[PDB]
Design a protein around this ligand. Structure first.
Ligand code: HEM
Ligand code: HEM
Ligand SMILES: *[C@@H]1O[C@H](CO)[C@@H](O[C@@H]2O[C@H](CO)[C@@H](O)[C@H](O)[C@H]2NC(C)=O)[C@H](O)[C@H]1NC(C)=O
Ligand SMILES: *[C@@H]1O[C@H](CO)[C@@H](O[C@@H]2O[C@H](CO)[C@@H](O)[C@H](O)[C@H]2NC(C)=O)[C@H](O)[C@H]1NC(C)=O
Ligand SMILES: *[C@@H]1O[C@H](CO)[C@@H](O)[C@H](O)[C@H]1NC(C)=O
Ligand SMILES: *[C@@H]1O[C@H](CO)[C@@H](O)[C@H](O)[C@H]1NC(C)=O
Ligand SMILES: [Mg+2]
Ligand SMILES: [Mg+2]
Lengths: 234, 234
């Protein structure tokens, strides 16, 4: 109740990440999306979601590469293509095709309509979505980057939405909570969402991501070396 | 005079980097080599050497990957092979062959004896040293990693010793200052070394590194993708 949802205003920077954006929209991260340090990310992920430090620390260290500042980033910086941001997102367009930053319903339609006839999204549907989103990028984006780096991140992001909106042990999440999370970047509190009472860790997320990977029918582009883009000055 | 040299004691952690180690040995960085943040690196490089932030910030952000902590590293963490630490060092052995952390005179002999008959090391001699050190690694290390990432770093490190011990405009450095720097990880103050009165920046270092690269007779291993090792837990 000390962390109400408020829509970002024009000064309030946001990322391509529903996880961080929802934390900002509740004031777990700064509402203005600016001046974010690694400890702020670690604290916010714990307080909002019961996500534990190891995975947040690595992501946040990589995220600092997107920023010219010594030890902060803004949420907008994290759009930098090829650092973390990648093609075949669940809810954003590819950088070469359109807007890699903002929620897009037409892209999200695939995830929205997944697991038809169930009340949850689960590992199986999440892998089908990864398969279909990458096939779309390969069909329409001549510049798609699809290495083990991007695929690993995509499996972890799908494990994240299942775990933070759902059950972090089983990887099942109520569809309506996932929809609100992406579309509104809001914690669905009035709708009955509760913060996980089990810690969400690398040991809970990695097995879910691995099972999603096995359900994705994936292969890498064989000619592309994985890379983390190291600065936005290129 | 408020930054005297003191040898590290057993609790005082050090890196594979003469630049950072010399800063610690003078107390510009903590003498114990522990609890180092990005702003500490930026401040220490400015105060000791007149090195400016951009290049320090990127290096320090990458250095955080070597540490399990949220926003610090120790100097010892920076030994992690394949993050920054690389084969064909000027003064350390390759990880697969021996000690990748401590100064080794037998390795340093090549740099020491370079530019025979001159009172300086310069771009030409620095490129000859890169050539000979990589040839040694290729001859003796079956596991050598030699991509554009490592070669770029090696050219910048050589530009660094020339610039901080010498003239940051020309890339010429008095031999005796460079020798003390590596062998003692000390600023050669009694010997006449003065901090650069011109700022050392990416715009001064990059042209030196580029000329060193052109004098190195380099080629990459064609089968190796450049990579930054992302954690020491692997
Ligand atoms: C706190 C827990 C987090 C959760 C639950 C979370 C969740 C997600 C999800 C589900 C996506 C995929 C969005 C899509 O494909 O449309 C995503 C993307 C992203 N996240 Fe996170 N995230 C979290 C933390 C972080 C952190 C710590 C960073 C970096 C500091 C980060 C940076 C990103 C970026 C840059 C993307 C865009 C990747 C892309 O789709 O192209 N996230 N996140
Ligand atoms: C402050 C200015 C700096 C100078 C003058 C400097 C100088 C050097 C030099 C000359 C080497 C090569 C040593 C050798 O090959 O034997 C080196 C290596 C290294 N430096 Fe720096 N450095 C500086 C800053 C940094 C920073 C900011 C980091 C990271 C936080 C860093 C991390 C390293 C590492 C890990 C190595 C080992 C690479 C290797 O030889 O395998 N240095 N440095
Ligand atoms: C994800 O949810 C789907 C839908 O409920 C599961 O697929 C069903 O599995 C049951 C039991 O095997 C079958 O009787 C149904 O016919 C399946 N339905 C459809 C529509 O495919 C799927 O098993 C779930 N995945 C996981 C990992 O729990
Ligand atoms: C680095 O120093 C060497 C040694 O002084 C320079 O090579 C000399 O260059 C002069 C002028 O061209 C010649 O007369 C000498 O015979 C060269 N000496 C040797 C021993 O090679 C070299 O030019 C310098 N490099 C740079 C970039 O300044
Ligand atoms: C999550 O699923 C696990 C495994 O089935 C179950 O034991 C636990 O009760 C579930 N969590 C909640 C809050 O229902
Ligand atoms: C460094 O070299 C430049 C270019 O020759 C010269 O102008 C400058 O005086 C030198 N610096 C010092 C401190 O001698
Ligand atoms: Mg994307
Ligand atoms: Mg080395």
């Amino acid at each position: 109740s000390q962390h109400p949802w408020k829509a970002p205003g024009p000064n309030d920077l946001r990322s391509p990440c529903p996880g961080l954006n929802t934390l900002a929209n509740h004031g777990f991260l700064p509402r203005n999306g600016r001046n974010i340090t690694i400890p702020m990310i670690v604290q916010a992920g714990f307080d909002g979601y019961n996500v534990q430090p190891d995975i947040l620390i690595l992501a946040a260290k990589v995220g600092l590469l997107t920023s010219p500042e010594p030890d902060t980033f803004t949420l907008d910086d994290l759009k930098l293509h090829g650092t973390i941001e990648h093609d075949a997102s669940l809810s954003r367009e590819d950088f070469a095709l359109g807007d890699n930053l903002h929620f897009n319903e037409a892209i999200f339609n695939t995830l929205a309509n997944s697991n038809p006839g169930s009340d949850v999204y689960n590992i199986t549907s999440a892998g089908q979505v990864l398969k279909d989103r990458l096939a779309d990028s390969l069909a329409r984006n001549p510049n798609v980057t699809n290495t083990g780096k991007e695929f690993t991140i995509r499996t972890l992001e799908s494990a994240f939405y299942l775990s933070v909106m759902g059950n972090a042990t089983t990887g099942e999440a109520p569809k309506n909570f996932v929809q609100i999370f992406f579309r509104e970047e809001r914690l669905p509190i009035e709708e009955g969402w509760k913060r996980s009472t089990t810690p969400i860790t690398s040991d809970t997320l990695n097995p879910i991501a691995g099972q999603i990977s096995e359900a994705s029918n994936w292969k890498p582009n064989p000619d592309q070396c994985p890379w983390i883009v190291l600065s936005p000055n290129l």
